[PDB]
Amino acid sequence: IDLKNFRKPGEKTFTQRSRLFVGNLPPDITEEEMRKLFEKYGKAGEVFIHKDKGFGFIRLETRTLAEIAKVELDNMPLRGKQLRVRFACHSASLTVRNLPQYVSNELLEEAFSVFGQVERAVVIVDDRGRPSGKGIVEFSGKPAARKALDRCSEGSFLLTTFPRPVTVEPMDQLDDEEGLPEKLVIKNQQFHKEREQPPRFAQPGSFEYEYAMRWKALIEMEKQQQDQVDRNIKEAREKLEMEM
Amino acid sequence: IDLKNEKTFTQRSRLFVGNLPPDITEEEMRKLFEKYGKAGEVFIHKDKGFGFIRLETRTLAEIAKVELDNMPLRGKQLRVRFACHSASLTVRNLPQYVSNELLEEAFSVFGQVERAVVIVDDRGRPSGKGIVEFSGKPAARKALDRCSEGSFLLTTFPRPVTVEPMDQLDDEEGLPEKLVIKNQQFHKEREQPPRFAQPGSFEYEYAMRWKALIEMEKQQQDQVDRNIKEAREKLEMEMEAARHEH
Numbered sequence: 001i002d003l004k005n006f007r008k009p010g011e012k013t014f015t016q017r018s019r020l021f022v023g024n025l026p027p028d029i030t031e032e033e034m035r036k037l038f039e040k041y042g043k044a045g046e047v048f049i050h051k052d053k054g055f056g057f058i059r060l061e062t063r064t065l066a067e068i069a070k071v072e073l074d075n076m077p078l079r080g081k082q083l084r085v086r087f088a089c090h091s092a093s094l095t096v097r098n099l100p101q102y103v104s105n106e107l108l109e110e111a112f113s114v115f116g117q118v119e120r121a122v123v124i125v126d127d128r129g130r131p132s133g134k135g136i137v138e139f140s141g142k143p144a145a146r147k148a149l150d151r152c153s154e155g156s157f158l159l160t161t162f163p164r165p166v167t168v169e170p171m172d173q174l175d176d177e178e179g180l181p182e183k184l185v186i187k188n189q190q191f192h193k194e195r196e197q198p199p200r201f202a203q204p205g206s207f208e209y210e211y212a213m214r215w216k217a218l219i220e221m222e223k224q225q226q227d228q229v230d231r232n233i234k235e236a237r238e239k240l241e242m243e244m
Numbered sequence: 245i246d247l248k249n250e251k252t253f254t255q256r257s258r259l260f261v262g263n264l265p266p267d268i269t270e271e272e273m274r275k276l277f278e279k280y281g282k283a284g285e286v287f288i289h290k291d292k293g294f295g296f297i298r299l300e301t302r303t304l305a306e307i308a309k310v311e312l313d314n315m316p317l318r319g320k321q322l323r324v325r326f327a328c329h330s331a332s333l334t335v336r337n338l339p340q341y342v343s344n345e346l347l348e349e350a351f352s353v354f355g356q357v358e359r360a361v362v363i364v365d366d367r368g369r370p371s372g373k374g375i376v377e378f379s380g381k382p383a384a385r386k387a388l389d390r391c392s393e394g395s396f397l398l399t400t401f402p403r404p405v406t407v408e409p410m411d412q413l414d415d416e417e418g419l420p421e422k423l424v425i426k427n428q429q430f431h432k433e434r435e436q437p438p439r440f441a442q443p444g445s446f447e448y449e450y451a452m453r454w455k456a457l458i459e460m461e462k463q464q465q466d467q468v469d470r471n472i473k474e475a476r477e478k479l480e481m482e483m484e485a486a487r488h489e490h
């Protein structure tokens with residue numbers, strides 16, 4: 001299995017999306033040895049090593065090059081330690097909501113580029129191709145993300161002729177890939193209290209069944225409350241959009 | 245640049261190969277993807293110009309996507325993308341002390357499960373939501389029906405989990421400028437560039453009415469969220485209070 005032109009010329013290189021966290025490093029890990037571990041992926045960008053704690057950061061060229069380095073070097077033995085290679089979180093990512101119509105990735109990137117250099121901008125799209133009203137804007141550095149978050153909350157940032165300001169907020173970063181493995185679970189007393197009963201269906205008649213059926217009725221109660229608010233919001237937004 | 249190296253041939257490694265030439269054959273598909281090892285199912289809509297091919301691992305599909313995307317093939321440029329999962333489920337109201345292995349073990353009673361993830365926040369805590377990926381639609385259908393009829397309990401705490409179809413959202417491709425239809429309403433909306441509403445204009449007054457309405461939506465949502473959390477507390481305290489049954 002060989003490759004070479006592992007690049008997409010349209011998008012930038014050495015962004016935060018290609019920065020890898022490397023844990024469980026040997027005590028005397030050097031910056032040159034760290035680069036030599038990743039030298040097969042071409043030249044690396046920013047490399048930091050905290051030699052005491054045994055962790056480090058390395059910035060590869062492209063995102064797909066880092067995904068190859070992750071699955072190849074994760075859990076790899078190196079002088080008595082199993083290396084932990086994960087993708088670092090993005091330090092300057094923003095969530096954009098209330099997007100108007102006819103907004104693309106390029107327009108979203110062009111719009112927020114006035115606050116600083118932008119690495120990536122996405123208009124989140126459903127399974128059928130239409131936008132969901134939400135988007136992602138990733139800046140190269142924290143100051144550009146701080147400026148975009150402050151100005152868009154104070155003033156009204158308009159992307160199109162439609163004078164509805166977009167809402168900017170920090171990206172709620174959720175890990176739906178690594179999750180919570182069994183070895184990372186806290187094995188305490190409340191652990192074994194819940195783990196006493198295996199996964200099962202509640203037997204009709206027991207205390208579990210009656211208590212769970214009240215939860216199902218309560219969850220259905222929550223759905224009726226939320227869906228009532230959703231219809232109230234739509235009628236309120238159609239009221240403002242009606243007047244001129 | 246040499247590579248060497250878990251469940252194999254899951255839906256996570258199925259690639260959509262679109263914009264195919266008319267005379268595309270099945271052995272030609274396995275010829276382009278032959279450097280990535282032996283492949284699984286190779287479907288070809290031999291009249292619509294698209295198809296699917298499943299590779300061994302997710303990594304072998306990640307590498308194959310960037311190499312064979314926009315590759316010339318008899319006058320046409322290929323469009324290689326990851327196919328969507330046809331049997332993914334969202335599990336909400338997860339109890340505490342639930343791991344990825346426990347979630348996979350639990351829902352395996354409905355059929356073959358490929359992957360199960362307990363969604364975790366940025367601080368290492370479970371968000372209460374989870375993902376369950378079955379190998380096929382029938383297994384996901386049984387999990388959805390059974391968990392809505394009866395109460396499926398994963399731990400000792402008698403709170404049933406909620407199983408709903410996965411709402412698949414694309415935050416990688418997004419919406420490029422090419423896909424936007426260049427109609428008259430498009431140009432009408434693009435007359436004004438991205439800008440801040442300057443005070444005094446008509447768009448500034450109308451925009452302030454929107455920020456006021458958005459704030460009212462924030463208070464309405466937070467009022468419901470407090471009414472839901474406290475109502476759940478009115479039920480969680482009745483656990484051991486009513487456990488004195490017999």
Ligand SMILES: *CC(=O)N1CCN(S(=O)(=O)c2ccc(OC)cc2)[C@@H](C(=O)NCc2ccc(OC)cc2)C1
Nearest residue numbers: 021023048057086087088089090091173365366367
């Ligand atoms: C989602 C998030 O914000 N996180 C989780 C991931 N990490 S980490 O990969 O650096 C990490 C920390 C500790 C650890 O031992 C238990 C294992 C992994 C954090 C993160 O990625 N922050 C982003 C960031 C910002 C600036 C810099 O400067 C180079 C690097 C990374 C917190």
Ligand SMILES: *CC(=O)N1CCN(S(=O)(=O)c2ccc(OC)cc2)[C@@H](C(=O)NCc2ccc(OC)cc2)C1
Nearest residue numbers: 126127128260292294296325326327328329330412
């Ligand atoms: C998220 C989603 O549901 N999608 C987006 C991805 N595609 S596709 O790129 O494969 C595609 C198919 C047909 C088409 O019209 C010519 C254009 C694009 C879809 C998808 O992958 N669905 C999942 C799926 C289910 C079953 C099978 O084979 C049995 C393949 C794929 C829709």
